[model samples]
Target: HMPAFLSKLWTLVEETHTNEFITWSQNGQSFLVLDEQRFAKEILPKYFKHNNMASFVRQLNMYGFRKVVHIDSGIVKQERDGPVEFQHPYFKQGQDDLLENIKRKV
Candidate 1:
Protein backbone atom coordinates (compact mmCIF):
# COMPACT_ATOMS: atom_id res chain seq x y z
CA HIS A 1 0.00 0.00 0.00
CA MET A 2 1.19 3.47 -0.77
CA PRO A 3 1.63 6.06 1.93
CA ALA A 4 -0.79 8.96 2.02
CA PHE A 5 1.81 11.41 0.76
CA LEU A 6 2.88 9.29 -2.18
CA SER A 7 -0.68 8.44 -3.07
CA LYS A 8 -1.80 12.04 -3.15
CA LEU A 9 1.33 13.21 -4.92
CA TRP A 10 1.02 10.56 -7.62
CA THR A 11 -2.60 11.41 -8.16
CA LEU A 12 -1.84 15.10 -8.32
CA VAL A 13 0.76 14.72 -11.04
CA GLU A 14 -0.99 12.04 -13.07
CA GLU A 15 -4.43 13.55 -13.30
CA THR A 16 -4.03 14.04 -17.07
CA HIS A 17 -5.24 17.32 -18.60
CA THR A 18 -3.68 18.86 -15.54
CA ASN A 19 -0.27 18.17 -17.08
CA GLU A 20 0.06 21.86 -17.86
CA PHE A 21 0.44 22.35 -14.12
CA ILE A 22 2.45 19.27 -13.09
CA THR A 23 3.77 16.07 -14.55
CA TRP A 24 6.61 13.54 -14.67
CA SER A 25 10.04 14.34 -16.06
CA GLN A 26 11.12 13.11 -19.48
CA ASN A 27 12.93 10.14 -17.95
CA GLY A 28 9.95 9.33 -15.73
CA GLN A 29 12.21 9.18 -12.69
CA SER A 30 11.13 12.59 -11.43
CA PHE A 31 8.36 15.13 -11.58
CA LEU A 32 8.06 18.82 -12.23
CA VAL A 33 5.73 21.63 -11.40
CA LEU A 34 5.30 23.64 -14.56
CA ASP A 35 3.46 26.58 -13.13
CA GLU A 36 4.10 27.29 -9.49
CA GLN A 37 1.71 30.22 -9.31
CA ARG A 38 -1.23 28.29 -10.66
CA PHE A 39 -0.27 25.09 -8.86
CA ALA A 40 -0.12 26.86 -5.52
CA LYS A 41 -3.23 28.89 -6.23
CA GLU A 42 -5.33 26.15 -7.77
CA ILE A 43 -4.16 22.54 -7.54
CA LEU A 44 -2.45 22.50 -4.16
CA PRO A 45 -5.37 23.79 -2.17
CA LYS A 46 -7.50 20.93 -3.42
CA TYR A 47 -5.19 18.26 -1.99
CA PHE A 48 -3.07 19.90 0.68
CA LYS A 49 -5.66 22.21 2.16
CA HIS A 50 -3.29 25.12 1.59
CA ASN A 51 -1.29 26.85 -1.12
CA ASN A 52 2.31 27.46 -0.19
CA MET A 53 5.13 26.56 -2.57
CA ALA A 54 7.83 26.59 0.07
CA SER A 55 5.78 24.37 2.30
CA PHE A 56 5.28 21.94 -0.52
CA VAL A 57 8.98 21.77 -1.35
CA ARG A 58 9.79 21.31 2.30
CA GLN A 59 7.47 18.36 2.42
CA LEU A 60 9.29 16.78 -0.48
CA ASN A 61 12.61 17.40 1.20
CA MET A 62 11.44 15.60 4.30
CA TYR A 63 10.66 12.61 2.14
CA GLY A 64 14.22 12.49 0.75
CA PHE A 65 13.47 14.15 -2.53
CA ARG A 66 15.78 16.61 -4.23
CA LYS A 67 15.34 19.47 -6.62
CA VAL A 68 16.95 19.14 -10.02
CA VAL A 69 19.55 21.66 -11.07
CA HIS A 70 20.50 22.31 -14.64
CA ILE A 71 23.98 23.20 -15.80
CA ASP A 72 24.60 24.22 -19.35
CA SER A 73 28.24 24.57 -20.27
CA GLY A 74 28.89 25.54 -16.63
CA ILE A 75 26.53 28.51 -16.85
CA VAL A 76 22.95 28.31 -15.71
CA LYS A 77 20.71 30.99 -17.08
CA GLN A 78 17.80 32.32 -15.15
CA GLU A 79 14.66 32.03 -17.20
CA ARG A 80 11.12 32.89 -16.28
CA ASP A 81 8.52 30.14 -16.42
CA GLY A 82 11.05 27.38 -15.93
CA PRO A 83 9.54 24.20 -14.57
CA VAL A 84 10.33 23.32 -10.97
CA GLU A 85 11.87 19.86 -11.15
CA PHE A 86 12.00 17.43 -8.26
CA GLN A 87 13.27 13.88 -8.15
CA HIS A 88 13.07 10.81 -5.91
CA PRO A 89 14.37 7.38 -6.69
CA TYR A 90 11.11 5.82 -5.65
CA PHE A 91 8.93 8.37 -7.34
CA LYS A 92 8.61 7.40 -10.96
CA GLN A 93 5.97 7.77 -13.60
CA GLY A 94 3.51 4.86 -13.82
CA GLN A 95 5.28 3.21 -10.94
CA ASP A 96 2.92 3.48 -8.03
CA ASP A 97 4.16 0.24 -6.55
CA LEU A 98 7.48 1.87 -5.76
CA LEU A 99 5.74 4.47 -3.66
CA GLU A 100 5.30 2.00 -0.84
CA ASN A 101 9.02 2.28 -0.21
CA ILE A 102 8.97 6.04 0.20
CA LYS A 103 8.54 6.93 3.83
CA ARG A 104 8.32 10.35 5.37
CA LYS A 105 10.91 11.55 7.84
CA VAL A 106 10.32 10.80 11.47
Candidate 2:
Protein backbone atom coordinates (compact mmCIF):
# COMPACT_ATOMS: atom_id res chain seq x y z
CA HIS A 1 0.00 0.00 0.00
CA MET A 2 1.11 3.50 -0.66
CA PRO A 3 2.03 5.75 2.24
CA ALA A 4 -0.88 8.07 2.97
CA PHE A 5 1.08 11.28 2.57
CA LEU A 6 2.96 10.15 -0.52
CA SER A 7 -0.08 9.00 -2.42
CA LYS A 8 -2.21 12.01 -1.66
CA LEU A 9 0.56 14.43 -2.52
CA TRP A 10 1.26 12.73 -5.83
CA THR A 11 -2.39 12.67 -6.75
CA LEU A 12 -2.84 16.28 -5.81
CA VAL A 13 0.03 17.49 -7.97
CA GLU A 14 -1.08 15.37 -10.90
CA GLU A 15 -4.64 16.58 -10.73
CA THR A 16 -5.08 19.08 -13.50
CA HIS A 17 -8.46 19.92 -12.08
CA THR A 18 -6.83 21.81 -9.23
CA ASN A 19 -3.91 23.18 -11.16
CA GLU A 20 -4.89 26.73 -10.36
CA PHE A 21 -4.40 26.11 -6.66
CA ILE A 22 -1.45 23.71 -6.78
CA THR A 23 0.75 22.29 -9.46
CA TRP A 24 4.30 21.33 -10.45
CA SER A 25 6.90 24.05 -10.67
CA GLN A 26 7.97 25.08 -14.15
CA ASN A 27 11.23 23.14 -13.89
CA GLY A 28 9.34 20.08 -12.66
CA GLN A 29 11.88 19.76 -9.85
CA SER A 30 9.41 20.85 -7.21
CA PHE A 31 5.81 21.83 -6.61
CA LEU A 32 4.10 25.13 -6.08
CA VAL A 33 1.13 26.36 -4.12
CA LEU A 34 -0.18 29.14 -6.32
CA ASP A 35 -2.91 30.30 -4.01
CA GLU A 36 -2.90 29.24 -0.40
CA GLN A 37 -6.28 30.71 0.54
CA ARG A 38 -8.28 28.88 -2.08
CA PHE A 39 -6.06 25.84 -1.81
CA ALA A 40 -6.65 25.45 1.90
CA LYS A 41 -10.36 26.07 1.50
CA GLU A 42 -10.89 23.96 -1.59
CA ILE A 43 -8.15 21.45 -2.33
CA LEU A 44 -7.07 20.32 1.11
CA PRO A 45 -10.44 19.21 2.42
CA LYS A 46 -11.25 17.39 -0.79
CA TYR A 47 -7.99 15.52 -0.94
CA PHE A 48 -6.14 15.51 2.36
CA LYS A 49 -9.20 15.59 4.58
CA HIS A 50 -8.07 18.91 6.08
CA ASN A 51 -8.21 22.60 5.26
CA ASN A 52 -5.27 23.91 7.21
CA MET A 53 -2.33 25.23 5.25
CA ALA A 54 0.02 25.08 8.22
CA SER A 55 -0.80 21.45 8.83
CA PHE A 56 -0.33 20.66 5.18
CA VAL A 57 3.05 22.33 5.15
CA ARG A 58 4.00 20.56 8.34
CA GLN A 59 3.38 17.26 6.65
CA LEU A 60 5.68 18.24 3.85
CA ASN A 61 8.37 19.23 6.33
CA MET A 62 8.09 15.85 7.98
CA TYR A 63 9.02 14.28 4.69
CA GLY A 64 12.09 16.46 4.20
CA PHE A 65 10.44 19.05 1.98
CA ARG A 66 11.88 22.53 2.20
CA LYS A 67 10.43 25.82 1.14
CA VAL A 68 12.08 27.62 -1.74
CA VAL A 69 12.21 31.29 -0.86
CA HIS A 70 12.86 33.59 -3.76
CA ILE A 71 14.47 36.90 -2.87
CA ASP A 72 13.99 39.83 -5.18
CA SER A 73 16.67 42.42 -4.55
CA GLY A 74 14.54 45.38 -5.60
CA ILE A 75 11.37 44.29 -3.83
CA VAL A 76 10.94 45.50 -0.29
CA LYS A 77 8.55 42.67 0.43
CA GLN A 78 7.01 39.80 -1.36
CA GLU A 79 3.28 39.77 -1.88
CA ARG A 80 1.49 37.85 0.83
CA ASP A 81 -0.74 36.30 -1.79
CA GLY A 82 2.05 35.25 -4.08
CA PRO A 83 2.86 31.67 -4.86
CA VAL A 84 5.00 29.58 -2.51
CA GLU A 85 7.17 26.71 -3.66
CA PHE A 86 8.72 23.66 -2.04
CA GLN A 87 11.37 21.19 -3.06
CA HIS A 88 12.58 17.75 -2.02
CA PRO A 89 15.28 15.61 -3.52
CA TYR A 90 12.90 12.82 -4.41
CA PHE A 91 9.90 14.95 -5.20
CA LYS A 92 10.51 15.80 -8.81
CA GLN A 93 7.83 15.55 -11.48
CA GLY A 94 7.38 12.12 -13.08
CA GLN A 95 9.43 10.69 -10.26
CA ASP A 96 6.85 8.82 -8.27
CA ASP A 97 9.33 6.06 -7.60
CA LEU A 98 11.58 8.45 -5.79
CA LEU A 99 8.85 9.10 -3.24
CA GLU A 100 9.46 5.71 -1.70
CA ASN A 101 12.89 6.91 -0.65
CA ILE A 102 11.44 9.85 1.21
CA LYS A 103 10.67 8.16 4.49
CA ARG A 104 8.98 10.38 7.03
CA LYS A 105 11.49 11.75 9.49
CA VAL A 106 11.47 10.13 12.88
Candidate 3:
Protein backbone atom coordinates (compact mmCIF):
# COMPACT_ATOMS: atom_id res chain seq x y z
CA HIS A 1 0.00 0.00 0.00
CA MET A 2 1.20 3.45 -0.81
CA PRO A 3 1.79 5.75 2.13
CA ALA A 4 -0.33 8.86 2.68
CA PHE A 5 2.50 11.17 1.73
CA LEU A 6 3.23 9.19 -1.41
CA SER A 7 -0.43 9.28 -2.37
CA LYS A 8 -0.56 13.02 -1.92
CA LEU A 9 2.75 13.40 -3.67
CA TRP A 10 1.49 11.47 -6.68
CA THR A 11 -1.66 13.54 -6.79
CA LEU A 12 0.42 16.68 -6.84
CA VAL A 13 2.69 15.33 -9.51
CA GLU A 14 -0.19 14.48 -11.79
CA GLU A 15 -2.09 17.71 -11.18
CA THR A 16 0.99 19.82 -11.68
CA HIS A 17 2.09 17.83 -14.74
CA THR A 18 5.30 16.86 -12.97
CA ASN A 19 5.35 13.14 -13.59
CA GLU A 20 8.49 13.40 -15.63
CA PHE A 21 10.33 15.06 -12.78
CA ILE A 22 9.98 12.37 -10.12
CA THR A 23 10.43 8.63 -9.62
CA TRP A 24 10.27 6.18 -6.71
CA SER A 25 9.65 3.33 -4.46
CA GLN A 26 9.28 -0.27 -3.52
CA ASN A 27 6.69 -0.53 -0.73
CA GLY A 28 7.00 3.24 -0.30
CA GLN A 29 10.50 2.65 1.00
CA SER A 30 12.31 4.70 -1.61
CA PHE A 31 12.01 7.94 -3.60
CA LEU A 32 14.10 9.97 -5.93
CA VAL A 33 14.26 13.03 -8.11
CA LEU A 34 16.07 12.05 -11.28
CA ASP A 35 16.49 15.60 -12.47
CA GLU A 36 16.74 18.69 -10.36
CA GLN A 37 18.28 20.97 -12.92
CA ARG A 38 15.30 20.64 -15.22
CA PHE A 39 12.88 20.87 -12.31
CA ALA A 40 14.39 24.06 -10.94
CA LYS A 41 14.37 25.49 -14.42
CA GLU A 42 10.95 24.37 -15.67
CA ILE A 43 8.62 23.69 -12.78
CA LEU A 44 6.68 26.77 -11.88
CA PRO A 45 9.24 28.46 -9.68
CA LYS A 46 6.96 31.15 -8.27
CA TYR A 47 4.83 28.93 -6.02
CA PHE A 48 8.01 27.46 -4.58
CA LYS A 49 9.82 28.82 -1.56
CA HIS A 50 12.47 27.15 0.52
CA ASN A 51 11.28 24.32 -1.75
CA ASN A 52 8.17 23.52 0.31
CA MET A 53 4.42 22.92 -0.11
CA ALA A 54 3.12 26.02 1.68
CA SER A 55 4.83 28.26 -0.78
CA PHE A 56 3.86 26.05 -3.71
CA VAL A 57 0.13 26.10 -2.97
CA ARG A 58 0.03 29.88 -2.83
CA GLN A 59 2.11 30.07 -5.90
CA LEU A 60 -0.33 27.74 -7.62
CA ASN A 61 -3.06 30.31 -7.10
CA MET A 62 -0.77 33.07 -8.19
CA TYR A 63 -0.25 31.02 -11.32
CA GLY A 64 -4.02 30.94 -11.65
CA PHE A 65 -4.33 27.34 -10.48
CA ARG A 66 -6.77 28.33 -7.76
CA LYS A 67 -8.93 25.33 -8.35
CA VAL A 68 -8.14 21.61 -8.21
CA VAL A 69 -5.45 22.24 -5.61
CA HIS A 70 -5.89 19.55 -3.00
CA ILE A 71 -5.87 20.65 0.61
CA ASP A 72 -4.32 18.34 3.18
CA SER A 73 -6.67 19.72 5.81
CA GLY A 74 -9.92 18.83 4.06
CA ILE A 75 -11.64 18.46 0.74
CA VAL A 76 -12.78 21.80 -0.60
CA LYS A 77 -16.48 22.24 -0.04
CA GLN A 78 -17.46 22.22 -3.69
CA GLU A 79 -20.96 23.54 -3.23
CA ARG A 80 -19.61 27.04 -2.89
CA ASP A 81 -15.81 26.67 -2.75
CA GLY A 82 -15.39 24.43 -5.79
CA PRO A 83 -12.67 21.81 -6.34
CA VAL A 84 -10.04 23.99 -7.96
CA GLU A 85 -10.01 26.75 -5.38
CA PHE A 86 -6.64 27.64 -3.98
CA GLN A 87 -6.33 26.21 -0.45
CA HIS A 88 -3.06 27.45 0.87
CA PRO A 89 -2.85 27.71 4.66
CA TYR A 90 -0.77 30.84 4.64
CA PHE A 91 -2.19 33.32 2.16
CA LYS A 92 0.31 36.01 1.42
CA GLN A 93 0.85 38.83 -1.02
CA GLY A 94 -1.75 40.58 -3.10
CA GLN A 95 -3.30 38.87 -6.12
CA ASP A 96 -2.37 41.72 -8.39
CA ASP A 97 1.14 41.89 -7.02
CA LEU A 98 1.68 38.18 -7.26
CA LEU A 99 0.50 38.08 -10.84
CA GLU A 100 2.61 41.02 -11.74
CA ASN A 101 5.83 39.56 -10.43
CA ILE A 102 5.21 35.86 -10.28
CA LYS A 103 3.64 35.52 -13.71
CA ARG A 104 6.62 36.33 -15.81
CA LYS A 105 5.89 36.41 -19.49
CA VAL A 106 8.31 39.31 -19.42
Error of 3 at 96 (Å): 34
Winner on TM-score between 1 and 2 is: 2
Model 3 Cα lDDT, one tens digit per residue, 32-96: 33354554456635323345444444445544434333455776665543222232222222221
lDDT of 1 by residue, 2-99 (tens): 56667788898888877998998888988989999998999888888679999889889999999998546544566764488999998888787788
Clashing pairs in 1: none
lDDT tens digits by residue: candidate 2, 37-73: 9999988998777799999999999989999987765
Q: State in Å the error of residue 71, model 1.
A: 3.8
Q: Report every candidate's CA lDDT.
A: 0.84, 0.89, 0.38
lDDT value, residue 35 of candidate 2:
89
Top of the candidates by lDDT:
2
Rank by lDDT, highest first. 2, 1, 3
The predictions' CA RMSDs to the true structure, in order, are 2.0, 1.5, 16.0
Model 3 C-alpha RMSD to native: 16.0
Candidate 2 overall lDDT versus native: 0.89
Over 4 Å off, model 3:
1-16, 44-46, 50-106
- Which residue segments of model 1 deviate by more than 4 Å? 72-81
- The 10 consecutive residues of candidate 1 with the worst lDDT sum are 73-82
* Alpha-carbon deviation at 7 in model 1, angstroms: 1.1
Q: Give the TM-score of candidate 2.
A: 0.91
Shift in Å, residue 15, candidate 2: 1.2
